[PDB]
Amino acid sequence: TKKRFTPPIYQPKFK
Amino acid sequence: AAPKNRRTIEVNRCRRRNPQKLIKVKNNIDVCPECGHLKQKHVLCAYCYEKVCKETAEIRRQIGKQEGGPFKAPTIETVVLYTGETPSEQDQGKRIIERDRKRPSWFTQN
Amino acid sequence: ANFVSWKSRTKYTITPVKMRKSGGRDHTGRIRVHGIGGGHKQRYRMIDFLRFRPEETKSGPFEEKVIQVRYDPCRSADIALVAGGSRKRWIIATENMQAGDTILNSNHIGRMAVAAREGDAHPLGALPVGTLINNVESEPGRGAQYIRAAGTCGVLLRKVNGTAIIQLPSKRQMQVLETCVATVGRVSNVDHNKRVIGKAGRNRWLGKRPNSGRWHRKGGWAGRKIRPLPPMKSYVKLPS
RNA sequence: GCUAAACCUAGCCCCAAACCCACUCCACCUUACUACCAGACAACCUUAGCCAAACCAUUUACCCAAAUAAAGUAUAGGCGAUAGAAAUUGAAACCUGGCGCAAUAGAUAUAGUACCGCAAGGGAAAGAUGAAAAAUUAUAACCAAGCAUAAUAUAGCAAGGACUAACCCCUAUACCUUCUGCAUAAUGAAUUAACUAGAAAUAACUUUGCAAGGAGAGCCAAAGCUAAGACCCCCGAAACCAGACGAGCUACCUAAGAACAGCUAAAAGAGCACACCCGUCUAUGUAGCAAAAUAGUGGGAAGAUUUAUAGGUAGAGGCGACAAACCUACCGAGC
RNA sequence: CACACCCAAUUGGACCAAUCUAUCACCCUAUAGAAGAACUAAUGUUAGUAUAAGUAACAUGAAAACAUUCUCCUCCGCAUAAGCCUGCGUCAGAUUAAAACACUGAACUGACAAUUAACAGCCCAAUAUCUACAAUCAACCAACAAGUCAUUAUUACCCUCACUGUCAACCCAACACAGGCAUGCUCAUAAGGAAAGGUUAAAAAAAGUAAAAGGAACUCGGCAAAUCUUACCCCGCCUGUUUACCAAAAACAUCACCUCUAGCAUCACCAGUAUUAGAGGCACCGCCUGCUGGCUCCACGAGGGUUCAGCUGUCUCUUACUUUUAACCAGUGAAAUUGACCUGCCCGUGAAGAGGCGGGCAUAACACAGCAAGACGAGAAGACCCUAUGGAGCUUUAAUUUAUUAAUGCAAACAGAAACCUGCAUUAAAAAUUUCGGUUGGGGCGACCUCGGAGCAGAACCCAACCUCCGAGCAGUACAUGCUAAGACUUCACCAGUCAAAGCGAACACUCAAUUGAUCCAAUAACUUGACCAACGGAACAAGUUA
Ligand SMILES: [K+]
Ligand SMILES: [K+]
Ligand SMILES: [Mg+2]
Ligand SMILES: [Mg+2]
Ligand SMILES: [Mg+2]
Ligand SMILES: [Mg+2]
Ligand SMILES: [Mg+2]
Ligand SMILES: [Mg+2]
Ligand SMILES: [Mg+2]
Ligand SMILES: [Mg+2]
Ligand SMILES: [Mg+2]
Ligand SMILES: [Mg+2]
Ligand SMILES: [Mg+2]
Ligand SMILES: [Mg+2]
Ligand SMILES: [Mg+2]
Ligand SMILES: [Mg+2]
Ligand SMILES: [Mg+2]
Ligand SMILES: [Mg+2]
Ligand SMILES: [Mg+2]
Ligand SMILES: [Mg+2]
Ligand SMILES: [Mg+2]
Ligand SMILES: [Mg+2]
Ligand SMILES: [Mg+2]
Ligand SMILES: [Mg+2]
Ligand SMILES: [Mg+2]
Ligand SMILES: [Mg+2]
Ligand SMILES: [Mg+2]
Ligand SMILES: [Mg+2]
Ligand SMILES: [Mg+2]
Ligand SMILES: [Mg+2]
Ligand SMILES: [Mg+2]
Ligand SMILES: [Mg+2]
Ligand SMILES: [Mg+2]
Ligand SMILES: [Mg+2]
Ligand SMILES: [Mg+2]
Ligand SMILES: [Mg+2]
Ligand SMILES: [Mg+2]
Ligand SMILES: [Mg+2]
Ligand SMILES: [Mg+2]
Ligand SMILES: [Mg+2]
Ligand SMILES: [Mg+2]
Ligand SMILES: [Mg+2]
Ligand SMILES: [Mg+2]
Ligand SMILES: [Mg+2]
Ligand SMILES: [Mg+2]
Ligand SMILES: [Mg+2]
Ligand SMILES: [Mg+2]
Ligand SMILES: [Mg+2]
Ligand SMILES: [Mg+2]
Ligand SMILES: [Mg+2]
Ligand SMILES: [Mg+2]
Ligand SMILES: [Mg+2]
Ligand SMILES: [Mg+2]
Ligand SMILES: [Mg+2]
Ligand SMILES: [Mg+2]
Ligand SMILES: [Mg+2]
Ligand SMILES: [Mg+2]
Ligand SMILES: [Mg+2]
Ligand SMILES: [Mg+2]
Ligand SMILES: [Mg+2]
Ligand SMILES: [Mg+2]
Ligand SMILES: [Zn+2]
């Protein structure tokens, strides 16, 4: 039950 | 709730091109007797309404130059005068507004 | 770490010197002593623990007049400002010391003992047996290091062949030369141990931080485990 | 007919050859790129571990200066996995080449730039007319999915047999993978284009050469020997170790500062109650204003308080009023 | 009439797309050689575009001469510090997306312009020598936590105002983000602003207001709301502290008490010295007790229960109105999801819960708004065991170690003696590496793992695991229980095991159902011997626990 957090992935801005 | 399957274009055309979605043709359009521009039966002519507002703004600009500031509304009637006109018999004791322009034909002096 | 000790002054002065706290950190910057940090700022007042220090132009026994006995933040006991000749210096005050009193500092050892007065500094070879003493030194010219705390006092148990037995406040005997200079009587603030902190806030005023919250099952006897011998290993625990 | 689709260079890869670069002026180890004052600080020290032994604990290949051969031999080794010589032998050696790549390829590179991260560090995307742009009256036609042209008529894996005829009739339980057995309501796939996965030894076999001999020293041979052909994949952990980088968030500490109305009270880790700090309950919100907020209601609010600035402690650790808390939005061991 | 032309894994073939090379060929081919040599599938990579969907969501106070004025809000504003670095000044632009708009369009592009030191920053000749007495209106008084501000002597020296910061609607949060953000003033403004794009007034949802009669009958619970309200029990002395992002507590800390360790200095402890310091337990005080333990009790608590009274739409039983949302019109325009769908109902069947299969019934086609029964609806998290000769944290009388550190010993060395250092041993400390063998739904407690026999496959052989039951891990007689050697059996492989004529040599293949253990290694002159290696085809030596 350990708290698992997945940070959001920011795509490169050039797209 | 997420879609279980992708809706096909054939299904989409029946919804997008349904007669309700389509724009309804208007049958209330008629030509203005004065200028000939298009108008609706229950709506004032756009061309004829614009010419009144153009003249109204010029008249209201002349009022501002006479009052010379806010909170100076006159307690008497107002008369709009053009070039080549004189105050009338009933236009006595009123605020005459001079306009350096010929009187418009649609504007009838009263 | 770029740690420089504040103890850089090389000339003695009665002026309170500003000192910077350590927080239990050594020169490396890591904690070496726990529970130390914060508290009210203090200025260190240098204490001359060598009572018999004759002036440059003088020698032999000399006298000092007490100017003021005041509070010292650094130490438990109080301190006294004394003036001897043309100089002033801080010393550790005794239980009975007032402003105006005259203390005597000598290095003379007479054939017979002398009337010991509280606050005076005489060698251990000229003090009567049993008299309470404080601020003793291991050897001559070493300076007082023992029996400094408030109310502490030693006992001159015996004197044989130029050496004397000093009973420390921890009830331990110590043998030092009879030429060591000691102060007669107890130290000031006798009722220092009778104080009540009152609240946890006052302990943070003295620069002491709360103890760790970990439940330490380890201790003097609990943590250290006697290894059972193979014959005794069978009898260590019996089901009941 | 729109969106688009096509193109050939830029340059690169592997070799050969030959041993490479760095003072125009000014500034640059202090807070680098900062004209201009007493320093004394000084460098050197076995790698480890993953992995193999189907665990693991001894052990486990890593150019050390001549290709070949001796030879995988002598030796070494939980005498297991595996490791492994030497004496001795002894060859050629002419850069300007390609059954190398051609914009998702070839270097990451149009550039270590944009951008991301406090830092160490990570790391792109793309260009295309013609001899002439001082011809733009251009650079025809046709091609993915997606659309438009052109919404739909009972009924059903969407098809097949058909039929005069789209449908109507009859027949038919999607694909892959994993299990004894999948229409399975088990796994995977919106779709299009491009890219993306079987590398090698002994022996044997097959086809030539020569033959008690074979082979361009060494090696094998009781028909062998020499040469060729023909057999052994891809993605994915949590981890471990080494060396760096991080305390501008947070934990605690150091230095020197700042803040706390009014009222009741009293020289109070006192009460009420703003600023401020905290986050009890409820509701909203749940790709939200917000990778933790909003409204109301609450705890503290002269103290073990709150807070700005600079410094310190760094991962076999730090720090901790112990919550296995925190150490830059995944800390039972950071990146 | 034709005939190689309907199996998984695997195996044997015959052909072969495209490409490069050799040689041909010359509207795209041939024979060979070579290889980055063929994609309906890896929650594949990159890119394009669909689906959800023109949906969610987003925005501009009113009139007007666009002078101005009006309505409303202000929990804000101005400045400095820090940070940022030209980021709504002017002009022009084929301009044209800031989440709407836009001609002057402009928080876009290009050019031009700018912030001027008095404020702030950037300071100081040497050597000695000086500096006991807070602050708080500092005067009373009263303290402890003991504090935030000073020179002189001599020598040297009389040149002068440089340099840098100065803008803005601004910073940290991927954004023009309802968040974060130090200080001085204003404490309601003299400054700064706009909640409504337009319309309609459905449901559902959110916030708010009002309510007959009743007043907790609601509910796990008086949660919310209303009102401004009494009495206790449990736990914790109290203020305080903690899981930043689900736990604020009864947990931690805390005075007080108690235990343990230490007789001393030049970097922590400490510029200290047992009335001290450190490591800990417990949680004040008071009472009682042993020679350490138990109750009581003041306040206190967003702790956990209980209760009087009141209060109330919590409820009997809901209703009305307002605002946001909503729906429609205009502008802008996402995301999870998605095998293909031409996507009905009832029984039956079926990897057992059918829109798709069987049998019946129903059925023109299409939007829009609701609903949440189904599509074992979608995303992510987690539970549940199990598996891995997969990890990690922790603990220890798991195994393996002392390199390291400390204390000693002897050697070395000095030496009229002693130390330091070094080498080698011996304890201890603190650590280091590594592992948790299987079987019995799970756990506990026990049993089990090899070999022989029976129930046990009635008749060649083999074969019923689990299960039920009884055994074996010997002993005895020999001492040719010597040496050799045809042919066979074989526990379904191998290893191992079994029988054996003849012959030499002697005499005149021992009994027994099982009665057993490989290799390496060790010992030995040789012979030969060595393991409840019983987990019995055996790892040289490794436990427990994880909520
Ligand atoms: K392993
Ligand atoms: K509480
Ligand atoms: Mg304590
Ligand atoms: Mg404790
Ligand atoms: Mg292994
Ligand atoms: Mg393992
Ligand atoms: Mg490339
Ligand atoms: Mg690239
Ligand atoms: Mg097409
Ligand atoms: Mg049909
Ligand atoms: Mg289905
Ligand atoms: Mg299934
Ligand atoms: Mg899928
Ligand atoms: Mg290891
Ligand atoms: Mg491992
Ligand atoms: Mg900090
Ligand atoms: Mg208070
Ligand atoms: Mg209060
Ligand atoms: Mg804390
Ligand atoms: Mg705990
Ligand atoms: Mg725990
Ligand atoms: Mg982190
Ligand atoms: Mg046939
Ligand atoms: Mg070919
Ligand atoms: Mg390929
Ligand atoms: Mg393809
Ligand atoms: Mg694919
Ligand atoms: Mg919808
Ligand atoms: Mg909407
Ligand atoms: Mg608005
Ligand atoms: Mg100035
Ligand atoms: Mg204003
Ligand atoms: Mg409205
Ligand atoms: Mg609206
Ligand atoms: Mg009512
Ligand atoms: Mg009830
Ligand atoms: Mg309430
Ligand atoms: Mg408490
Ligand atoms: Mg109290
Ligand atoms: Mg509290
Ligand atoms: Mg929390
Ligand atoms: Mg907190
Ligand atoms: Mg909470
Ligand atoms: Mg406690
Ligand atoms: Mg009740
Ligand atoms: Mg009641
Ligand atoms: Mg009503
Ligand atoms: Mg719209
Ligand atoms: Mg999408
Ligand atoms: Mg249908
Ligand atoms: Mg059914
Ligand atoms: Mg049917
Ligand atoms: Mg539903
Ligand atoms: Mg689901
Ligand atoms: Mg296994
Ligand atoms: Mg473990
Ligand atoms: Mg056999
Ligand atoms: Mg075994
Ligand atoms: Mg076995
Ligand atoms: Mg067997
Ligand atoms: Mg627990
Ligand atoms: Zn008209």
Author numbering:
A (entry chain d): 37 to 51
B (entry chain 0): 79 to 188
C (entry chain D): 61 to 300
Reproduce the article's own wording on this structure.
Human mitochondrial ribosomes (mitoribosomes) are responsible for the synthesis of 13 oxidative phosphorylation (OXPHOS) proteins, encoded by the mitochondrial genome. We determined structures of eight distinct states of the human mt-LSU where a total of seven assembly factors (MTERF4, NSUN4, MRM2, MTG2, MALSU1, L0R8F8, and mt-ACP) were bound in different combinations. We characterized in detail three of these intermediates, resolved to 2.9, 3.1, and 3.1 Å, and referred to them as states A, B, and C, respectively. They represent the key steps in the late stages of mt-LSU maturation, during which functionally important regions of the rRNA progressively mature.
Binding of the NSUN4–MTERF4 dimer to the immature, but compositionally complete mt-LSU, sequesters the flexibly disposed H68–H71 region to expose the active site and allow access of factors that modify the rRNA and check its conformation. The NSUN4–MTERF4 dimer forms extensive interactions with the rRNA and ribosomal proteins by contacting rRNA helices H66, H75, H81, H87, and H93, and keeps the C-termini of uL2m and mL48 in an immature conformation. The MTERF4 protein folds into a bent α-solenoid that binds with its convex region to the surface of the immature subunit and exposes its positively charged concave region towards the outside, where we observe a segment of double-helical RNA bound. Although we could not assign the identity of RNA nucleotides in this region, continuous density can be traced from rRNA helix H67, suggesting that the additional density belongs to the H68–H71 region of the rRNA. The interactions with MTERF4 expose the immature rRNA regions corresponding to the PTC loop that forms the active site of the ribosome, as well as the A (H92) and P (H80) loops responsible for binding the acceptor end of tRNAs and positioning substrates for the peptidyl transferase reaction in the active site of the mature mt-LSU. Consistently, no RNA substrate was found in the active site of NSUN4 where a clearly visible S-adenosyl-methionine (SAM) cofactor was bound. The most prominent rRNA rearrangement involves the PTC loop, which in state A surprisingly forms a helix with the P loop of the 16S rRNA. We conclude that formation of a stable NSUN4–MTERF4 heterodimer is critical for their function in mitoribosome assembly.
